[PDB]
Structures are given as C-alpha cells and as structure tokens.
C-alpha cells in the first residue's frame, strides 16, 4: 500500500477545456540539493557597483521552494494560442499541488570514486505557509519555476530573504527579524509517502485580453457637431470669441474621460534606429528614493505604452525583457537585441500614453494686457478623477500573480510586472532534506557539524482551474490572431533543437481580439 | 500484496480452440534502454543515395513502444497450421495487454568495472494512446515486435516520427508539428506495480483464406451453348457477320465479371532463370510522385499475382520478401535467393492478373473502308464496375493490421502489405524510464543534464480473441494441406539450432483450402 | 432504374444565368495569364461537379447502309483481358458506356448484347447477318454515358515553357473516378434476370 | 474535414527503426538476383500500405513572376471529356489532386 | 392581425455558437422582375465560339428562384474565421426559410 515498491502518484499533464472553465495539469521532476550543509547563514552586502541600494542584510536557509508562478509552467504554446485568440479574459479559480515518488540519494567520495546510493530510511520535510508569516519571495520575478517544457528536470531554488539593514550598509537594525523555518509544523516524508495541498483563489477581476478598437479621445460621433462651444480667440479689444465644435474635429471636442498616469522614460531605437554612441545609461534612468538610497524601477507603473505601433523606438525601462534561453547564475555577459525577447505594449496605445514623450501642457502664468499667455509641458502626471488605462499585458513567459504588501494602505493593487495582485496568494511550499549525522563516537555539547551528504528527487503535479470570459462581438471583418508564421524556418519554434535544447524565439501576449471602448 | 517480494503477474502463453472462437495468449520478456539520455532530439535528412524522397524532418523521443503487429507474435507454427488447413477465414475480436514484474537496473562505471545494481525506488512510465493523437508508427512493417519464439528477450524500439519537410529538403515547414509525449497523462510504475489495458476490435470482414477453385472467365457451363452471338467478321461487302457462342469456348463467351486492377511491374527469374547481367534496377522500378519526389512502392496495390503457378518468374516489386533470420541494424550486405523468404500469390491466379504481363488491349482507331481496325495493349488498368479480385494473403511472418490514414476520403481500405485496415487500430503503448538526476550541489536555471544511467526490464502478456469461419464444402477429393515435408533434413524447421538460434526456412500463408467462385 | 435521363450531364447549369467562376483563357505577349467569365449557356466552358462513368474504347461497326470495311477477320482486333497467360474476349464490356449514339448506324458490337430472333440447334457454326439478329441499343443512356467507339477525352502531355508550347493527347480508356455517375446495362425481355457475385476477398460495384 | 495532414503519406514509417522487409536491388554478372534490407528513414525504398488518390495531368501555368509562354490561345490544349459526340472542358478536375505545390 | 399595416416578419441576422451546434440566421431584401412578360419561351443555341458543346435546347420561365448555396450567404467573415481556426469539421443539420413583407 505505502512502501518502497509502490508508486505514490501518477503523471498528470493535460488540459481540459469545458465551457467557461479550463483545468491545466502539469507534472515535473525536481531535484533538491542540501543547501548550506544544513546551516542557517547570515548573508549581507555593502554598496556594490557604485550603488548603496545594493546593500542588504538577510539570511539564507537550508530549505528550498516550489515556484508555480510563470504561465508556461501551466500552459502549452498551443493551449495559450487557443486561449488568447478565442477569449476576452481569464482568472484563476483554484489550485492543488501534490508531491510524490520521493527518492533520497546518499553520495560518498573515496579517492574520487564518488558513488551514489539511495537511502530508503531517509526523510524529506515539507510545509506550506498558510498564514503568510514568512517573507514571501515568490512573486518577484526570479528564477526557479517549473520548466516550460515537461521533459526538463529542474533544481529547487534556495530560500532566503533580506530584512532591514542600517544606514544603507550591511549591518542590521533592531527591527531586523530572524525567521526559523523549523519552527513551523511540517510533514516528514519517506519514499512511500506523498504530500497534497489545495487552495482557492480569492475573487479578482479578469485579466482583460483584448485591444481597444477606438481611440479614447475619438469616442464622439464624426457625423454630428457638438452643442458645446470653445474659446477660440480675442479681438482687437480684449473681448473673447467662441466657435462651435464641429463634427469630426477631435482636437477641439470636449472629453469625458482622460488617459492614465504617466512618467517619462527615455526612448531607444531598436533595429535600424541610430541611437547614440557609448552611453553608460545608469545615471539617466528613472529612479525612486527610499531610506536615502536611489533605486531603478525597471518596469514603470501601469498606464503607459512602451512602443508606439510600428516604430523602432522603445522605452526599455517600461519594457519586460526576456532571454530566448536560460542562463547560468551570475552571468555578466552583454547581450544584443537578437538574444532578447522584447515585449511591446503598443496594442494599448489608443488608451495609454507613450512613455518617451511629454504628456501634455498647462498654463504657466496669468495673462494681462501686458503679458501674453504661456504654457509648458509636463513630464509626469498621476491619477486623476475620470482616468482610464489598461494594465500590463501577461505573457506566456511572465508571472501569474503577486502578493500585495501588508501595510496600512494601497491603491489599485495591480502588479507592475503583470498578473493578479493577491492579498492571500498561493502559499509558499518549502522543502528540505532532513539531516543524517555522520559517525559520532563521543558526547559533545556543541552541535553536530558532520553529516551524510545527500540529495532528493521526485515529482510534483500542479492543477489549476481557470475561469474564462467568452468573446461576444459584432465585428464583421476578421480579426488578428496569433499565428505560427515564419519565412524559411531552419527549425520549428517552441520545440527541441537537434541537441535537445528547447527553443522559444518570440514572446506571446494575450491581446489580439479587439473590442470597442 | 504490492511490493518488492511479490510477483505482479504470471506467465500465460497458450491457445484455446473453442468452437468458432480461439484465444491466443503469449508472454515475453522485454528490456528498455534509456534513449537519447532523456532528450528530445530533432532528426533530419537530406537527399541520400541519389533520391530526395529520402529527405525528412522529424523528432526522436526518449520513449519506446510495444509492437504486437506480426502474426508469429501471437501464433505457434502448429497453431497456424491448424488454422489455415481447417478454416475459411478469421478476424480479431478483442485484445488485452498487461505489463508486469518491472525491474529497474542502475549501471555505473568506475575504471571499467561496470557494475549493475537494481534501483527499487525507480519508476517507469506507461501510457496508451486511445484517441489516436500521436503519429501512429506501428502498421508500417518495421522491426521491434515481440519475438516469434517465446524464450527470446527483445529490446523495445525507440519512438520517433517524421513531420512535414520543406521543398524535399531537411528543413521544416510552418505545419511541421512537435508532439510532446510527456503531455499525456501516464501511469507510473515501481517494482510491485503493473499495468493492464483492454481493447475491442471494430467490425471488419474476415480475411478470406481459401483459393478459388474456378477461373473467373470459365464460370459458364461447358456443356451448353450461349444464347448470345458475337461479331465474327465482315464479308466482301462491308456487311457484318455473326456466330453463336458454343459450349466450352471461353475465349469467346460473354462475361458478367472482370478481373481486378493492375499495373505492370518487371518480372525476374528466380532459380535457374537466366535474367540479365549487371542491372542497377533502381531506375526501372515502378514509382509514384508526391510533392515533387519519386517513391518506389515495393508492394503494389491489391488485385495482381506476382508469380504464375510453377514458373520461375516473380515480379519482386509485387512481392513480400522476408529474411530467414533477423539482421543487425543498418546492414548494407547483399543477399541472394537462398537467404530470402520470397512469397508467392499464385493461389490467386484464377481471379487476379499477373503483374509482369500486359492486361489486355483496346481499339486505337476508327475503321473505314480505307483503314483497318487497330488495337494496342495497356500496361495499367484501375477499378472498373463489376471487378472482383483477392486481397494480399497474410503470412505468419507478416503484419496483422494497419491504420487507415485520416483524411477526407479513401477507397477499399485494405493494406497493401496485408491484414486488416482499421480506422481505430489497437492503440500505441508507450513506455520510458523516468529520469533520476545525478549529484547536483548548486542551483542553476538550466535543466539538469546529468542523470543516473539505468534500464528496465519486465514481462508483457498479450491476449487476443479471434473469430473463425468454418469450412463448409462438398468437394469430394482431398485438398492441399500445409504439411511438414523435407527430404533428408539436417535440422528441424521452426525449432532452435544446435547453437540455440531459432530457424524458420519457409514462409507460411493462409490459402490452402479451395472454394468455388 | 428504368427511365432515361432527360438532361445532359454537362448541361445541368442554368442557361439563363452566368457563373461566378472564371476560366484561364489565354496569355498575352508577355507570359502573363488572362481570364474570362463563364457566360450563361456556354456548356463547353462551365465548371462541372460530376463526371461520366468509366470507359474503354471498342471498335465501331456500321449496320445497315454503313460501308464498313471488306473481309475483316475481326478476332485479332477485339478488346481482350489476360488471365493466367491467356487472352480472353470480353464481349460485353464493363458498365458506363453506350454502344450506339442515337440514330447513327454505328454500333460497337463488342459492347452490345446480340440475340437471335429464333432458337438454334446445338453447335451451329452457321454465319448470320443483321436481319437474323436482335441487336440492342443503349443509346437512351447517351446523356450520362460515353460512346464506346470514340476517345474519352484528352490531358496534358508535357510541361510548357517559354521554349515549348502546351501539348495534349487523347486517351482510349479511363476508369472509376471520384464523383462519377453512369447508368447500368439495361434489361431486356430476352435477357438474364440475375447473376451471382463471385466469392473472393473483394469486389467493386457488383452489377 | 477541415484540417491539413501533418505527415506525408509515404513517410508514415518510423525513421529510427529498419523494416524487416527486403527489396530487389540488382543482379550480378550472372542473371542472379540480389536483395538489400530497407533501412530506417529511407522513404524512397520502403514498403507502403496506402497510395495517393487518382490523378490526371493538367497544364501548369506560372503566376506572378513566372515566365510562361507568349500568345497562347489555350482552348485547344485544355483537358476535355466526350459526351454524345461533343468535347467539353471540365474546369474543375476530379478530386484527388493539388493544383499548387506549396510556395511555387 | 394579417393586413397591409402589420408586418409579417422581423429581421433575424445573427449567429449562435452553442457547444457543437451553431445556428446562423441571415435576412436579405430581394426584388423580383416579371420575366418574359408572363411567357414561357423556348430557348436554344447552336455551336458558338467554335464548339458544338455550346449548343442546347431548353425553356425559360416567368419564375424566379431563391439560391442559398454560397457560404458567405450564411456566414460572416469573423464567424468563418472562428470556425476554421477552432474546428476539425462541420456539416449542415437543418434549414428553415421564410418569405415575408411582400410588396407588389
């Protein structure tokens, strides 16, 4: 029933499209190193690369964690296409995770033989953090998620966190906190044991995957004039003059609604664009301040568009930039446009303001008979009553959710990188190898530092349920679809290479179907 | 109950003849290599051996498959004799497969010791493809079936397929598809686990195993004349003259029914036949065209006979040619008539037209007082209303079934090589070794490439049910039977050799009993 | 089915209305290709859903006043098929042709059912003329069936180029094709009611 | 059926495994016949269960930049069938062929 | 109820995608000439454009007819796209026609 020669799970990887629901099942194989050699280590940094915003104080743990938070973990490229071409929206309903077929392997080294055997009596520890009492590291856009491609085996990331540091240095504060993860009740698993967990997502709005089919400022009827008048000019006396707003003149018409917030970020020309030679580009990025340090915010807040339709100019600090292939840890290499997957928000340009231009102008003075009217442009503007914008699009390579920070107050909790802001997101699932001491022949009151070196492996299946929003549209002519289109392909995209390396050439977002404002 | 020291199956190899049913049970031992080292590799080829029909694009998988599709897998030589001598027909009713007694063996190499141990915690994955969503590679006449002889242990073949390639080159198309086999739900099996599957064949016609006891054109009564008249000649004036059709003159009589379709293939003289010296023979074979390439079709379509009774002349491109013994992969050696098992269709010669002769003649002109009548022979003719033929015979060494390709339309879906055309054939049963990573001490976001090398072995039993058609005949004199007949045998045929190598000297087909048209 | 077709197979379109389909007419002084619309009752040029039945060409012979040719032996030039190394005359042909074309004198005579107006003694080697014979005509099927003594059509024999012009050639035989429609041999008061389908593996359209 | 086939009709065999079937390759200096094994992904040489649909040959013409031929009347060289002593163009052909070959 | 000032139908033009079914409704406005001036006329042709396959004999009638037989009559370009991108096949199940709001 439960033992060494009986499998504790099966491989469920699949998708089931039923009505407005869809359930996606994905199973992967993982391997867990024994991190720190069963130690909690205090990690810290001072200012590096000329910035004291890189200073931190924190801890690294023996534990490791499961990260479900990228879309390609749950979705096939063909299932993502079926979703984005056919639907106006989706949101996650529920989640359940299972960890099974555990294998603990003891490794030994004598004169460089390095033999490996399996320890049938050894245990692994697993707990889920249901009450959100640990620092939540998942939604921050870091590596270690289940692979995009099911055959791939992956290592679990090491768990660690940064607490408060003092005066932008590597030293701690009195409010720097240490969290022991052994002080949670956890479940201990041998080979025949398995683990199961179930979670229900809180109510969130649908991700709206459509593009606006109208301009925000062109919403008026082009055939009929307005009954509203505008101040045109003033005669040779100071007397003021008025004209009627006519038909399709959209510069002059009255508006109910206004674009979303903005801040200006530098545009850079990809491809044939000429740009400028030998820029260092760190000093001129947009920044914010905390605690006397200056941080780059590489996504900006929502309400802008990084690219304007078919132009070469991108903001690059308003963009999500991906690599076409995974990289080694700590790679300082320089990459070009061809190596990069550079997303475009230009499907939102009707309702959103371009990031590399000014946002408008306002009056800078009071006129008189003596002085003429004057204006000036503004490079930043924030939330205004009657504003409408679109949120950052979601990509198959991008994050599903984020956790809203726990403080007093927040506004419109939509993550800048993308996805769903969640007060109670899917909990963190943490796992470690239980230590097995080496040969100890004596009593000592100092803790045991000599352990059998070992690692564990197994399978994990995740099952998510998604709610779908049907596309109900009276558009007569055909729409834009995500299609598989390449001229003289030397390989097929989203498939293994001749070596076995899985290749993804281009990013895929959700906004294709079009809808009127 | 379910564990390491309890066997999960028994050896069932047997046959039970009951009425019109017969059930054949056969168990074998298999071994499964770990293919590609757990990788999906893109395989491709350009034009080789001077033919761009050999170019392809496709994928090879870590998986391997069970292939039940030759008759000697299910049938003994004595049970095949009891079948073909006593019955007019058979068709498969049902099938059930079981995979049990799984053993996973870890192999390690230190300074060329190459030790082998068994990993009791390791798993194997098995799924059946019920919905026919994968490329179906089974019915195509390729190696890797269960052996003919029960003591033999066999390796499972590696699964792979070819998709669309572009312009008869090795490059892909936009419609080239990649199928991940991890994206099916599969069942994971440790040592104590087993797998079971059941299948019911769809309704097909009986394979008709009998020979015609009459000629197609001799069906008339030789004693009585016809009441029908033929145009014999014309007198010194153009006036036309007629004669009566008399008694047993079968050249001249009217016919209701006509032979099956034909195409002409080159005849070659086996044995003492003189043939012709130093022919390359590739340029003069029959071919068909697809996509701008020219393919040999080494079986032809049904409706011809390759050999005419006791002549030495064979078509050899209308023939199924077997080896008396298995061969190594990729063997370029040249073989002679003695090494080969060369089948003859000559039992069908009454109803089927010989492949190496013309099929007839037709009028090539309009006569007149000035011009005389003219005809010419045709080398090919296709399906005609009122045609009757016999399908390719089945052999103990040959395929049981094929899958009808999924397209719009098809005609008379009988496989050219033989057996039963099936819209939903027995599903493919695919199996792989689950990967066990090696020692990984660090986190990396690139997939794990280092694995424990291991293989698995076990037993598989297949149970098929067959429906039989009784032979009901009023023939007075004895018939032809398949008999075991050899003059001065130095060994017994269909038995092991002095070395242990199983020997089959001659092919055995189903058509012995005779029946009138 | 005892009726005759009241329409031609290729004339099924409405003669009053044009097709919305276009045909390749020609090419200009450059190799550029040109198209025209299919108009109203032009039935040579219109698109077709359905096609005539199978054929093979058999020699036509002129009954009555037709002149024919003198002193033909006529056995060597009949249509034949092969079995087992022998060559047989098939005096009916397969279905899907018409032996006579309406009121013409020309008959195929190897596509025809020929009867005697009176019974004969067994083993009679006598020669008979047209007047002694009952010679059936299938011409009521001529709208849907192809005449046996003519070619059945033509197809392209080459690939063109700037250097070479398009070429075709006629074919004397054609077999079952997807979307074919024909009529079966008619039954006569003097003829057979039924036949037995031979017992083999396979058969097609057992008429 | 609105889908396209994802495989070639003649490429249905497994490219990894050889066939257990042999082909007549040649004949030696005596008339004796010789045989070779069908290997792996050689799809020119392999045995086939299934065959393409029916055909008849119709003249190909080059659209776009294709050079073609000058001043063709093109009625006399079309494919035709006969009924009742007349010769008709059948501007669609019967099913079982493809008019264009991919990006040509 | 039934008279000159009461409409005998409504405009139904729409499509409803439900499961494996889809129903397409389309309404059009037609005009009917009086053909032949209420006569049956015998129409015929000899060989024209050098082909005797163009010869025919037939009749033209005062009548006219409704023809539903092209796909774009029943389908939008956006509904055709939703069909061909998402499905492996289709066949017609049923049909119903209505003729209303007659004006002479």
Author numbering:
A (entry chain B), B (entry chain A): 208 to 724
C (entry chain G): 415 to 621
D (entry chain I): 415 to 518
E (entry chain I): 208 to 311
Published text:
Adeno-associated virus (AAV) are small, non-pathogenic, single-stranded DNA viruses classified in the Parvoviridae family, the Parvovirinae subfamily, and the Dependoparvovirus genus. The AAVs package a ~4.7 kilobase (kb) genome in a non-enveloped, icosahedral (T = 1) capsid with a diameter of ~260 Å. The assembled capsid is comprised of 60 monomers in an approximate ratio of 1:1:10 of VP1:VP2:VP3 (7, 8). VP3 is responsible for assembling the body of the capsid, which functions to transport and protect the viral genome.
At 4°C, most capsids, ~96%, contain packaged genome. The gross capsid morphology is conserved across the three temperatures. At the center of the threefold, a basket-like density is observed at 4°C, 55°C, and 80°C. The DNA binding pocket is situated below and adjacent to this density and is comprised of amino acids E417, V419, P420, D609, H630, P631, and S632 which have been shown to interact with a nucleotide between P420 and P631 (26). At 4°C, a nucleotide has been modeled at the twofold interface situated in between the unresolved density and residues T223, W224, M225, G226, R289, and L290.
